[PDB]
Symmetry: C2
Subunit: 370 residues, 2 copies
Amino acid sequence: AMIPLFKVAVSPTALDRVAEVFASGYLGQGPRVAEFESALAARLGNPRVVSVHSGTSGLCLALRLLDAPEERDEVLSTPLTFEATNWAILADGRRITWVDVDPATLTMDLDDLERKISPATRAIIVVHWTGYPVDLDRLAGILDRAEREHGFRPAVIEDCAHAWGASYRGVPLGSHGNMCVFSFQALKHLTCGDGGLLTLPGDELHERAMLRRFYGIDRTADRLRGAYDVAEWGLKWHMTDLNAAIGLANLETVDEQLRLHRENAAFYDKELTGVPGLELLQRSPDREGSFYVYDVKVDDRPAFHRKMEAAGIMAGLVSRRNDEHSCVAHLRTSLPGLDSVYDRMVSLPVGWWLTEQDREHVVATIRSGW
Amino acid sequence: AMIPLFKVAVSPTALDRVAEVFASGYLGQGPRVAEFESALAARLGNPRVVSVHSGTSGLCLALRLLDAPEERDEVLSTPLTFEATNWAILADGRRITWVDVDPATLTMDLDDLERKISPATRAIIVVHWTGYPVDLDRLAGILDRAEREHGFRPAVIEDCAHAWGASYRGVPLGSHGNMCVFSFQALKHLTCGDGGLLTLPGDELHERAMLRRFYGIDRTADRLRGAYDVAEWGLKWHMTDLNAAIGLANLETVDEQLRLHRENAAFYDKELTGVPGLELLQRSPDREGSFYVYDVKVDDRPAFHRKMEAAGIMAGLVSRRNDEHSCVAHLRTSLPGLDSVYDRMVSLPVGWWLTEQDREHVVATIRSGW
């Protein structure tokens, strides 16, 4: 019985909701999308939420919403993320400038970020990697100083794909003044099969997002009579009712599943300290992460991997560090923080599908040495 | 109740197929996608088919696959199409050069096309508008001459969104040597809810398409150990099993529905002759269209619209001509062919949902004058 690192959480009520969509004969973007958006807005405490096709499409739309001259061609991003984060930048026609990783958190090194903001910086994408939030107040201070130095304030987009339900300093992600993109892909906490959510900090961005997620076409307009105008183009970035229905079905139990992710993480916190050759990540008590996976850093990782495999525990990387891909060989730079942890890091199963017996087995296996 | 211009065709067997996907617990791109691709390949007679998220994503992927220098920044396209065709060009970072419309067919004016091919021409997107195929052999000859003149041969991408099941000179669309993009959006002939198909004329393009439709990530690789390399980036352009299951269910009856589209069109051809103020489009016998809608051209169209509305018949435009949108005001050009028909054209319901009584009602209403 292999314990997986990721698992789909699809409610046995999803079929009932999909049946409703098929029976209605309306499969497009309609009342279920509206219902799902309303439900998400209430949970988030941000009314400005825009459902989208995927987290990836949400990131593409967020970048498209930026108003800055083309000469501002740089987007700052870390390579320790899923490729979507960074390929969205390339698809937006911009150049990636890599920011290092803080070895203590495995999220963006904000000292390195501050050093790399330049007059060419149009945006910064920050990833709440594996569900652990970035220090958003510190980030805001960095931007305050950058604005005072350069005369403009680079936009921040928060990639929240791993961080449904997370909060920082008593405020849910989505409400810290930056655009945020959540993912409802099959393996994420809340799934629509595929889907995402772009949240906006203000009305102008909200209104532009609603338009540009469907070609810039106002869907309330009389399209049969050509009585609409596309002010700004967009693509097919919206969510439809088929996927909103699945999301609605999965909302019922996502909180309990999050609670289990967090309970399991707390168990590992307690039981994996004092293991020679294993280092835990120290998480700050001023925020609440979502633990998409549970990261540790180990000595002799090849032996650790063999140990996990033999014990039927799936353990490893979420992705290859993106700066190593040959498609971006021309963008390589020195990232010593990431270098110092990349051969040590390993993600462990921590999700709702872990029985007490499962999580005990993970801990017992690790404690028997490798 | 009103006779609609478009209607969703979703089989009562779709729920059974979706239940299968949910029961498998695998919602990603997997065995149903493979099954659907195999079925489509057999129908098309082209083994090189790549399922994608939507027709729009198929067009975006096709444009990314092009090999041409940045100074070839021009894509030739007509504005008489759905906005996706042209917004894909803008999202690709290119410049649209509008091509006029042949008033006799409402598809691209190929004389105007040949005049507008230039040293900057990167590609040509041709749209089989409302289901009627473009003269692809003539197009190939134009490109032969362009290649002689410039040394490069601009690529053609065929937008087949309206033309599932269409053929030209005895050969199914998808097999004329150009990349083709089909749409399986809800209102299209064959629907997956959302989905599309990119077909390729050669193996190299096929292999690149299969990689780039999912971030450039080889899905057979060991991602847990970071044992993969992205040679060329992509986005989340693929189709997943939820939508492939719906497409599989809808394959059963799409042929009969197509037969009805064609039968209804033939009925209109026969019964709408000699109507004062109404001009039919003359279609060539060397090809077989799919009649997404049935186009005519009328005098005093505002009165014609009021007549249709009062009779409970939905009639009008599929889209506003795209060159009128303010987002492309800088690209306006004189298109006298399109100008000569744009205030006259009207699309009529012609699909499988038309009863004999419905189509007789359409004909009787039109023949009674306006």
